[PDB]
Amino acid sequence: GHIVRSPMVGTFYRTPSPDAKAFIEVGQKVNVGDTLCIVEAMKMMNQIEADKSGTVKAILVESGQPVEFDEPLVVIE
């Protein structure tokens, strides 16, 4: 299907705060407008919004694992 990819480089975080629920989790589908993860860069915890409404098939990364530009994050079928 479709894969949404980080458009910038930085640490990958899914919970907005150190002890917080993940914005999204496997199973529950998302919509076009919704935050999927946090890509911290210089302490400015940015956010990523999907573009195609569909099920969250899986998450290809893990919290704390740095990611690069265009790094695939999640695949939506």
């Binding site: 860069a41 210089m42 302490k43 400015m44 940015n46 893990e62 704390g64 694992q65 740095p66 690069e68």
Partner: protein, 284 residues
Amino acid sequence: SWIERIKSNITPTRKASIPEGVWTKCDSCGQVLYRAELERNLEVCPKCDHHMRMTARNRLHSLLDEGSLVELGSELEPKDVLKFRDSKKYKDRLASAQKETGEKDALVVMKGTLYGMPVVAAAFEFAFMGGSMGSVVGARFVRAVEQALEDNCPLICFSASGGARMQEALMSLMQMAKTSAALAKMQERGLPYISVLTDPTMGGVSASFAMLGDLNIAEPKALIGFAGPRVIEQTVREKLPPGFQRSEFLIEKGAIDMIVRRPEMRLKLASILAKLMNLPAPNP
């Protein structure tokens, strides 16, 4: 054969610490920015040139020369009598804003000098309850206008407010007339009063003294008008024109003199005032 590698992943354990307050963002375009760069380019995102908020004291310092600053009306503080009981208590919001912003009210006044020419300036701290024109706001405005009248010197101000201070009810509304009377008293003298509009300039402030000065200088992409776009949207129950209440639109519709970007502002005011007051041109 290195030509064909494994494309390995990065190790998460590696960890470097960057200082927190050295990198900022511009939501208008999304480009992360170097805080000192943005702060040195008068809070102007150099990527998309999108103007942002600036502190009242920072703005006054930016315009005025250094070492000649003199604050006016510093003893005036809110003295709520309407004890307005909202979801919060008006005293609660008053104190919260006062401590959060470090200023007594929205407006700050600081007599100073521009390129060796005496002048009085002021500005609104929009963070203060939407920068509403409270009793202290009008009182400080009167104080500044009186200072300008007693000492022959142009008076300048910058507009940033979401409307009059509701919690003070009709006390704020009446201030519009006080400000208008003071501005008339000065215009009849021959002392120019240039008001530079900055987003947001809406409601009472826009219709009181924002639009009243000799010149009306709207900083780009600033929201200027009278009625908030939500109110007009619900009333006309239609789609507002693109660029509604935008300086690039209110110069098209005659209400706005000239669009000045922040970096020129101090020279733009200095040249125009040195002309009008009939003084020799400023030296770059």
